[PDB]
Design a binder for this molecule. Structure first.
Ligand code: MG
Lengths: 166, 35
């Protein structure tokens, strides 16, 4: 085992110098040894990234996967610690910064076949990690416009040298 | 002799509140400190 993520809440910062930008709250939370598989859990983790916590809760709630109820409880816990144990004004102000699955330790079993052959069957467990940040969700990146591309292309034609030439 | 037994109850039952809960309106301020 390795526990790191949990300890990321134990960092205490030096106090604020006058009038700087207020550094927004970071909350870390994990859940270890869920009975779900890592690969299935990955899709849930991928879905809610970058969302505001309310949208994420909305999505998760109606989703079918059995991982949905799990990640849901984890986001509620995260929110509660966000307002209680740290200080966060306006509890809906959170958005999901980083969401991810690691593999936990696995159980091993026999799987019988036929003609007396056996496969080795691995009972799957996984961890779920989530980092929440206080502030409005970051803006989603817009697809490059023709005015962008033409600018790249010109910038490249104009970066040439006469090679091996001096 | 027509005697009735009954098993004696051997345990007759005869014998011989702190709320420190954090303040909802304090907003996480460590109340011991007065100012
Ligand atoms: Mg295998």
């Amino acid at each position: 085992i390795s526990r790191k993520w949990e300890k990321k809440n134990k960092i205490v910062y030096p106090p604020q110098l006058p009038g700087e930008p207020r550094r927004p709250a970071e909350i870390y939370h994990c859940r270890r040894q869920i009975k779900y598989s890592k690969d299935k859990m990955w899709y849930l983790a991928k879905l809610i990234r970058g969302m505001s916590i309310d949208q994420a809760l909305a999505q998760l709630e109606f989703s079918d996967k059995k991982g949905a109820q799990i990640i849901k409880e984890v986001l509620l816990e995260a929110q509660d610690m966000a307002v209680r144990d740290h200080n966060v004004e306006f509890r809906s102000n959170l958005y999901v910064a980083e969401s991810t699955s690691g593999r936990g330790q696995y159980l091993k079993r026999i799987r019988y076949h036929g003609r007396g052959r056996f496969g080795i069957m691995e009972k799957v467990f996984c961890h779920y990690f989530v980092k929440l940040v206080e502030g409005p969700p970051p803006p989603r990146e817009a697809p490059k416009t023709a005015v962008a591309h033409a600018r790249e292309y010109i910038q490249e034609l104009r970066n040439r040298t006469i090679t091996h030439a001096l | 002799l027509g005697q009735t037994f009954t098993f004696p109850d051997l345990f007759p039952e005869r014998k011989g509140r702190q709320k420190h809960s954090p303040d909802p309106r304090r907003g996480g301020v460590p109340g011991w400190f007065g100012l």
